[PDB]
Amino acid sequence: RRKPLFYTINLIIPCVLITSLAILVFYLPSDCGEK
Description:
Radius of gyration: 15 Å
Entry title: NMR structures of the first transmembrane domain of the neuronal acetylcholine receptor beta 2 subunit
PDB class: transport protein
Largest sheet: none
Assembly: monomeric
Keywords: neuronal acetylcholine receptor, beta 2 subunit, Cell junction, Disease mutation, Glycoprotein, Ion transport, Ionic channel, Membrane, Polymorphism, Postsynaptic cell membrane, Synapse, Transport, transport protein
Name: Neuronal acetylcholine receptor subunit beta-2
Number of helices: 1
């Protein structure tokens, strides 16, 4: 492991961004309790 806060940059940024966008669309954390 490298220095604290974020280890090896094995495409972690794009992975996190894609995951975030997916969950955002997939889960849809909208301020409404219809789901």
